[PDB]
Each structure stands twice: as C-alpha cells, then as structure tokens.
Coordinates of C-alpha atoms and ligand atoms in Angstrom, one line a residue:
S1 CA 9.6 -33.2 13.7
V2 CA 9.7 -30.2 11.3
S3 CA 7.2 -28.7 9.4
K4 CA 7.3 -27.8 6.2
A5 CA 6.8 -23.6 5.3
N6 CA 3.9 -22.1 3.3
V7 CA 5.9 -21.1 0.0
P8 CA 3.6 -20.0 -2.5
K9 CA 4.4 -19.9 -6.2
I10 CA 3.4 -16.6 -7.9
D11 CA 2.9 -16.0 -11.3
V12 CA 4.7 -12.5 -12.2
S13 CA 4.3 -12.5 -15.7
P14 CA 2.1 -9.9 -15.0
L15 CA 5.0 -7.4 -13.7
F16 CA 6.3 -7.6 -17.3
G17 CA 3.0 -5.9 -18.8
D18 CA 0.6 -3.3 -18.8
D19 CA -2.4 -4.6 -16.9
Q20 CA -2.4 -2.5 -13.8
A21 CA -4.9 -4.4 -12.3
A22 CA -3.5 -7.8 -12.9
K23 CA 0.0 -6.3 -11.3
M24 CA -1.8 -5.2 -7.9
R25 CA -2.8 -8.6 -7.7
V26 CA 0.8 -10.2 -8.0
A27 CA 1.5 -7.0 -5.6
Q28 CA -1.1 -8.2 -3.1
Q29 CA 0.5 -11.8 -3.1
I30 CA 3.8 -10.4 -2.4
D31 CA 2.6 -8.8 0.6
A32 CA 1.3 -11.5 1.9
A33 CA 4.2 -13.8 1.5
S34 CA 6.4 -11.1 2.6
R35 CA 4.1 -10.9 5.9
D36 CA 4.2 -14.6 6.6
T37 CA 7.4 -16.9 6.4
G38 CA 9.0 -14.2 3.9
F39 CA 9.5 -16.4 1.1
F40 CA 7.9 -17.2 -2.4
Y41 CA 8.6 -18.6 -5.8
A42 CA 8.3 -16.5 -8.9
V43 CA 6.8 -19.0 -11.8
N44 CA 6.5 -18.1 -15.1
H45 CA 9.7 -15.9 -15.1
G46 CA 10.9 -16.2 -18.8
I47 CA 14.7 -17.4 -17.6
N48 CA 16.0 -20.3 -19.7
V49 CA 17.0 -22.0 -15.9
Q50 CA 17.9 -25.2 -17.5
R51 CA 20.8 -23.6 -19.6
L52 CA 22.1 -21.5 -16.3
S53 CA 22.2 -24.9 -14.9
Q54 CA 23.9 -27.0 -17.6
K55 CA 26.4 -24.3 -18.5
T56 CA 27.2 -23.7 -14.5
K57 CA 27.9 -27.4 -14.4
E58 CA 30.4 -27.4 -17.1
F59 CA 32.3 -24.8 -15.6
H60 CA 32.4 -26.2 -12.1
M61 CA 33.4 -29.7 -13.1
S62 CA 36.2 -28.5 -15.9
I63 CA 38.1 -25.8 -13.9
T64 CA 41.3 -27.3 -12.5
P65 CA 43.8 -26.1 -9.6
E66 CA 45.6 -24.4 -11.9
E67 CA 43.0 -21.8 -12.8
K68 CA 41.2 -21.7 -9.5
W69 CA 44.4 -20.0 -8.3
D70 CA 44.6 -17.6 -11.2
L71 CA 41.0 -16.6 -10.4
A72 CA 41.0 -16.9 -6.3
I73 CA 39.9 -13.7 -4.2
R74 CA 42.1 -12.4 -1.6
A75 CA 41.5 -14.7 0.9
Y76 CA 42.8 -17.5 -1.0
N77 CA 45.6 -15.7 -2.9
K78 CA 47.5 -12.9 -1.3
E79 CA 48.5 -11.7 -4.8
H80 CA 45.2 -10.4 -5.8
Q81 CA 44.3 -7.7 -2.9
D82 CA 41.9 -5.9 -5.2
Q83 CA 39.7 -9.2 -5.4
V84 CA 37.4 -9.0 -2.0
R85 CA 34.1 -9.8 -4.0
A86 CA 34.6 -11.0 -7.2
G87 CA 36.2 -14.1 -8.0
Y88 CA 36.7 -18.1 -7.3
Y89 CA 36.3 -19.2 -3.8
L90 CA 38.2 -22.4 -3.2
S91 CA 37.0 -25.7 -1.5
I92 CA 39.4 -27.0 0.8
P93 CA 39.7 -30.8 0.4
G94 CA 39.3 -32.5 3.5
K95 CA 37.9 -29.4 5.2
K96 CA 35.8 -27.4 3.6
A97 CA 33.2 -28.6 0.7
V98 CA 31.8 -25.4 -0.8
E99 CA 33.2 -23.8 -3.5
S100 CA 31.9 -20.8 -5.8
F101 CA 32.6 -17.8 -8.3
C102 CA 31.2 -14.7 -7.7
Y103 CA 31.1 -11.5 -10.6
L104 CA 29.9 -8.3 -10.7
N105 CA 28.3 -5.7 -13.1
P106 CA 29.8 -6.5 -16.4
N107 CA 30.1 -2.8 -17.0
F108 CA 32.2 -2.3 -14.2
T109 CA 35.6 -1.8 -16.3
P110 CA 39.1 -0.1 -16.0
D111 CA 37.5 2.7 -17.6
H112 CA 34.3 2.9 -15.3
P113 CA 34.5 6.0 -13.1
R114 CA 34.2 4.1 -9.9
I115 CA 36.8 2.2 -10.7
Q116 CA 39.1 5.1 -11.7
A117 CA 38.0 6.5 -8.1
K118 CA 38.7 2.8 -6.1
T119 CA 35.3 3.2 -4.6
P120 CA 35.0 0.4 -2.0
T121 CA 32.8 -2.7 -3.4
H122 CA 33.6 -1.9 -6.9
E123 CA 35.9 -4.1 -8.9
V124 CA 36.4 -5.4 -12.4
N125 CA 35.4 -9.0 -12.7
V126 CA 38.2 -11.8 -13.1
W127 CA 37.1 -14.7 -16.0
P128 CA 39.0 -17.9 -17.1
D129 CA 40.3 -18.6 -20.4
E130 CA 38.0 -18.3 -23.2
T131 CA 39.7 -21.0 -24.9
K132 CA 39.5 -23.5 -21.9
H133 CA 35.8 -22.5 -21.3
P134 CA 34.7 -21.5 -24.5
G135 CA 31.1 -19.2 -24.1
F136 CA 31.4 -19.4 -20.5
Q137 CA 31.8 -15.2 -20.2
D138 CA 29.4 -14.7 -22.5
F139 CA 26.7 -17.1 -21.0
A140 CA 27.6 -15.3 -17.5
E141 CA 27.5 -11.6 -18.7
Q142 CA 24.1 -12.6 -20.4
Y143 CA 22.7 -13.9 -17.6
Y144 CA 23.3 -11.2 -15.2
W145 CA 21.3 -8.9 -17.5
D146 CA 18.2 -11.6 -17.8
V147 CA 18.2 -11.9 -14.0
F148 CA 18.6 -7.8 -13.7
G149 CA 15.6 -7.6 -15.9
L150 CA 13.8 -10.2 -13.6
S151 CA 14.9 -8.5 -10.6
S152 CA 13.5 -5.1 -12.1
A153 CA 9.8 -6.4 -12.6
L154 CA 9.8 -8.2 -9.0
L155 CA 11.1 -4.8 -7.4
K156 CA 8.0 -3.1 -9.1
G157 CA 5.7 -5.7 -7.6
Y158 CA 7.3 -4.6 -4.3
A159 CA 6.8 -1.1 -4.4
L160 CA 3.2 -1.7 -5.5
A161 CA 2.6 -4.0 -2.3
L162 CA 4.1 -1.4 -0.2
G163 CA 1.3 1.5 -1.8
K164 CA 4.2 3.4 -3.7
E165 CA 4.3 4.1 -7.4
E166 CA 6.1 1.3 -9.3
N167 CA 9.5 2.6 -9.9
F168 CA 10.2 3.5 -5.9
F169 CA 12.8 0.8 -6.0
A170 CA 14.1 0.1 -9.5
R171 CA 14.8 3.8 -10.0
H172 CA 17.9 3.3 -7.7
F173 CA 18.7 -0.2 -9.8
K174 CA 20.4 0.7 -12.6
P175 CA 22.9 -0.8 -15.1
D176 CA 25.2 1.6 -15.1
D177 CA 26.3 1.3 -11.2
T178 CA 24.3 -1.6 -9.5
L179 CA 26.1 -3.5 -6.8
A180 CA 24.3 -6.6 -8.0
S181 CA 26.1 -9.9 -7.8
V182 CA 25.8 -13.5 -9.4
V183 CA 27.4 -16.7 -7.2
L184 CA 28.0 -19.7 -8.9
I185 CA 27.9 -21.9 -5.8
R186 CA 28.6 -25.9 -6.0
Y187 CA 27.8 -28.1 -3.1
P188 CA 29.8 -31.6 -4.0
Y189 CA 28.5 -34.9 -3.2
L190 CA 31.8 -36.1 -1.0
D191 CA 32.0 -39.6 0.5
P192 CA 33.5 -39.3 2.9
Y193 CA 32.1 -36.1 3.9
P194 CA 34.4 -33.6 5.9
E195 CA 33.0 -33.5 9.5
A196 CA 35.0 -29.8 9.4
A197 CA 32.5 -28.7 6.7
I198 CA 29.3 -29.8 9.1
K199 CA 28.1 -27.5 11.6
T200 CA 25.7 -28.3 14.4
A201 CA 23.1 -26.0 15.2
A202 CA 21.9 -25.0 18.6
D203 CA 18.7 -27.6 18.0
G204 CA 20.7 -30.5 16.4
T205 CA 20.7 -29.9 12.9
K206 CA 23.3 -30.7 10.8
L207 CA 24.2 -27.7 9.0
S208 CA 26.2 -26.6 5.9
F209 CA 25.6 -22.6 6.3
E210 CA 24.3 -21.1 9.4
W211 CA 21.6 -18.6 10.4
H212 CA 21.7 -15.0 8.6
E213 CA 19.8 -12.4 7.1
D214 CA 20.4 -11.5 3.6
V215 CA 22.8 -8.7 2.8
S216 CA 20.5 -7.6 0.1
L217 CA 17.4 -5.5 -0.8
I218 CA 15.9 -8.7 -1.9
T219 CA 17.4 -12.0 -3.4
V220 CA 16.7 -13.9 -6.3
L221 CA 17.7 -17.2 -6.1
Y222 CA 18.0 -20.2 -8.0
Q223 CA 18.6 -23.9 -6.5
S224 CA 18.7 -27.2 -8.0
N225 CA 16.0 -29.6 -7.1
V226 CA 17.6 -30.9 -3.8
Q227 CA 16.0 -29.8 -0.6
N228 CA 18.3 -27.5 2.1
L229 CA 16.8 -24.3 3.1
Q230 CA 15.1 -23.5 6.3
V231 CA 13.3 -20.6 7.6
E232 CA 13.1 -19.4 11.1
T233 CA 9.8 -19.1 12.7
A234 CA 8.2 -18.3 16.0
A235 CA 7.9 -22.0 16.3
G236 CA 11.1 -23.0 15.0
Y237 CA 12.8 -23.8 11.7
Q238 CA 10.8 -24.8 8.8
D239 CA 11.8 -26.6 5.5
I240 CA 11.5 -24.7 2.4
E241 CA 10.5 -27.5 -0.4
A242 CA 12.5 -27.3 -3.6
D243 CA 11.6 -26.0 -7.1
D244 CA 14.0 -26.2 -9.6
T245 CA 11.8 -24.3 -12.2
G246 CA 11.3 -21.4 -10.2
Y247 CA 13.0 -18.9 -8.4
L248 CA 13.1 -18.2 -4.6
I249 CA 12.4 -14.6 -3.5
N250 CA 13.2 -13.4 -0.3
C251 CA 14.2 -9.8 1.4
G252 CA 17.3 -8.5 2.6
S253 CA 18.2 -6.9 5.4
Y254 CA 18.2 -3.3 3.4
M255 CA 14.4 -3.8 2.9
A256 CA 14.0 -4.5 6.6
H257 CA 15.6 -1.2 7.5
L258 CA 13.5 0.8 5.1
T259 CA 10.1 -0.7 5.7
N260 CA 10.7 -0.3 9.6
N261 CA 10.8 -4.0 9.7
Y262 CA 7.4 -4.7 8.0
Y263 CA 8.9 -6.7 5.5
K264 CA 11.3 -8.5 7.8
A265 CA 14.5 -10.0 6.2
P266 CA 13.6 -13.7 7.3
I267 CA 16.6 -15.6 9.0
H268 CA 17.6 -19.0 7.3
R269 CA 20.2 -21.5 7.3
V270 CA 21.4 -24.4 4.9
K271 CA 21.1 -27.7 6.0
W272 CA 24.1 -30.4 5.3
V273 CA 22.8 -32.9 2.3
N274 CA 25.3 -35.1 0.9
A275 CA 24.3 -34.6 -2.8
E276 CA 26.2 -32.8 -5.7
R277 CA 23.8 -29.5 -6.2
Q278 CA 23.8 -26.0 -7.5
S279 CA 23.1 -22.7 -5.4
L280 CA 23.0 -19.7 -7.8
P281 CA 22.1 -16.5 -6.0
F282 CA 21.6 -12.9 -7.3
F283 CA 22.1 -10.5 -4.9
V284 CA 19.9 -7.4 -6.0
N285 CA 22.2 -4.4 -4.6
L286 CA 21.7 -0.5 -5.5
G287 CA 24.1 1.5 -6.1
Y288 CA 26.9 3.0 -4.0
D289 CA 25.4 6.4 -3.3
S290 CA 21.6 5.4 -3.4
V291 CA 19.5 6.1 -0.2
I292 CA 16.1 5.5 0.2
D293 CA 14.3 7.4 3.0
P294 CA 12.6 4.9 5.3
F295 CA 9.0 5.0 6.1
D296 CA 6.5 2.7 8.1
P297 CA 3.8 1.3 6.0
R298 CA 1.6 1.0 9.3
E299 CA 1.6 4.4 10.3
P300 CA -1.2 6.5 8.6
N301 CA 1.7 9.1 7.3
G302 CA 4.3 6.6 6.8
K303 CA 6.9 8.6 9.3
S304 CA 9.8 6.8 10.8
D305 CA 12.5 8.3 12.9
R306 CA 15.1 5.3 11.2
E307 CA 18.2 7.2 9.4
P308 CA 18.7 6.9 6.1
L309 CA 21.3 4.6 5.2
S310 CA 23.5 4.8 1.8
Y311 CA 23.5 1.6 0.2
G312 CA 27.3 1.4 -0.3
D313 CA 28.2 2.0 3.3
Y314 CA 25.0 -0.9 4.4
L315 CA 27.1 -3.0 1.6
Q316 CA 30.6 -2.7 3.0
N317 CA 29.7 -3.5 6.3
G318 CA 27.0 -6.3 5.6
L319 CA 29.7 -8.5 3.6
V320 CA 32.3 -8.0 6.4
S321 CA 29.8 -8.7 9.3
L322 CA 28.4 -11.8 7.5
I323 CA 32.0 -13.5 6.7
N324 CA 32.7 -12.8 10.5
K325 CA 29.8 -14.3 11.8
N326 CA 29.3 -17.3 9.7
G327 CA 33.0 -17.6 8.3
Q328 CA 34.7 -17.1 4.5
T329 CA 32.9 -19.0 2.2
Ligands
ACV1 C1 21.5 -19.5 0.6 C2 22.0 -19.4 -0.7 C3 21.8 -17.9 -1.0 C4 23.5 -19.2 -0.4 N1 24.2 -18.5 0.6 C5 25.2 -17.6 0.3 O1 25.7 -17.1 -0.9 C6 25.2 -16.8 1.5 C7 24.1 -16.3 2.3 S1 22.7 -15.5 1.7 N2 25.8 -15.4 0.9 C8 27.0 -14.7 1.1 O2 27.9 -15.5 1.4 C9 27.1 -13.5 0.7 C10 28.3 -13.6 -0.8 C11 27.9 -11.7 -1.3 C12 29.1 -12.0 -2.7 N3 30.2 -12.5 -2.5 C13 29.2 -10.3 -3.0 O3 30.2 -10.1 -3.1 O4 28.2 -9.9 -3.5 C14 24.0 -20.6 0.1 O5 23.6 -21.5 -0.7 O6 24.9 -20.9 0.7
FE2 FE1 20.8 -16.1 2.7

C-alpha cells in the first residue's frame, strides 16, 4: 500500500544558544533531512502549542457568519478590494469545507512606508471585535513573534547546513518588513461530507488539497494530531506521521531557487480525512526587496548561473500561481 516517510525529530534547542559545535550537529541533521524527504520535526522549540491550539479553536468555533463577511478577503467580498492576503477565507456549506484566517506582520500599520506606498503584498491586518473575541488579537500578534523567533533560529541552522555564516538568511528576515504570514486553518468534521470538497488524485487517493511546492523560504507548521500530509518521492507518495507537540518544517521554492535545487522544495499534498483538525502554518517570507544571490553548494566555487530573484516579485507571482493551480482556499 502506502509507505511512511522518514521524518526525523530534531532537537533545535542548541540553535538558541552559544555552543557552536552543538549548532553544527543540528545543522548536519537539517542538511540530511533536506536532502532526503525534505521534512523534519523541530522539537524542544519552546512554543506553547497547547495555548495556540486552544485559542485557535475558540476563535473558529465562536465566529459567526456576520463577522466572517466583515473580515472576508476580496475573493468572498467585493467591498474589500485591499484584502488580497489578510482576512477570512470562508467555507461554502455543501461545497467547500476548509476555512481559514490569515494575518501578516503586525508592524504593517497605516503609518508603515510600504503601506503608504501601496506596495503589492503588504496589507494591514483585519481583526474581529475585541468584545466578541477577547484576547484573540493579543494572542495572535504574540504568536507571530514567538514563531518568528523560532523561525529565525531555524534559518541559522539552514545557513550553517549549507556552509554559510549563521546570519546568511536571517539577516533578511526582519520584524520591520517581513512578508511572513500565519494562517489559522480549520478542517471540519462534516457528515455528510461535501463531495465537491474532495479531489481525486491521479493515483486514486482522495485529497483535500492537491500537490504543490510551497511559496516560502521555509514553512513552519503546527497541526493537530490527525495524519493527513503526504510527500512525493520517486517511488510515490509517502505518509508523514502526525506529531502535535512538534513543528513540521520544510523548504519552499525560494530555497530551491537560491540553492540550485540542492535543497528541493518537496512536493506534498493533503489527504482527505473526515475529522475536526487544525493546520497552522507560518510561511517564512523575507522582505519585498530582499535578494539573495543564488549559489550551488555542489560546486567547489559555489558558482551558479541562476538569476537573483527579488523576494517580493517571487511572492506576488507565487501566490497567484498557487491559486490558479490548486484553487481559491
Ligand atoms: C499544508 C498546510 C501548510 C496547509 N496548506 C496551505 O496553507 C497552502 C499550501 S502550503 N498554502 C496556501 O494556500 C498559501 C497561503 C498564503 C497566505 N494566504 C498568504 O497570503 O501568505 C493546509 O493544511 O492545507
Ligand atoms: Fe504546502
């Protein structure tokens, strides 16, 4: 039938410290995972994921249709022309099961210069009413910075894994301008489950979301303990086992570009499972003007012929292409 992917659990705690040899040992494990299936679990990460899951559940379960329209992105509410990324992504009863809420850098305010200039991909977050959802915005903004901190540390591991100084990626990952997003996704239990929400893969597997590479530098994902993800290998798709204490980490296609595909962006898909669950990704994106010169770790000199790609142009094109290929979420 279907085999299981080798997804190692890596203790990332040395990446927060000052023991340089211990950091190299973490980096070696990141390298090995990135060259194998492309996924690993980050453990001993220091984030209170129990509070994350509880607060996210309380939001998803208490928000009403009125509030969802008021928060909806432009795809669901033509009045909200400025909300392409941030806001609520509605389910469609009988047709579309998944819903989610996406928010961006809390530092993007009307006062921010990228907002003043109307630069694409930058938006001001929208939030529910504090009286109906007490503490939610405070929790969500805090969480952004908590997962930002973990992601910064992981980026030091990836830099060391590739033979670079530890700030090689992290220097471009800044609180003032990061395009990183959090998505709070609800996959509901439904009976009957809408057939229109289930896709059939070429190999017959029933899916909630088709194969893709991620639009990110790396993706830092929390999920509740319901198995759903599969990664493509040359010998077919393999199941990724769930772990609701760890963060699942993989590279996105910007990492594949800048390493000349030495660290590939793994192709993965989401199997259909009729179970109430959470999927909480943090997409590690750089700043709009961030450019990293591509290199090829396989070459003594690291020379690559690939063109440098501005992160903002990469992200704008990548988000649109993912909608065109796999559907509006
Ligand atoms: C596999 C998970 C990461 C998750 N998939 C997803 O969230 C999928 C594929 S990675 N991602 C997207 O649609 C991109 C959302 C980008 C976000 N609106 C933004 O503006 O930054 C899932 O559970 O479906
Ligand atoms: Fe993905």
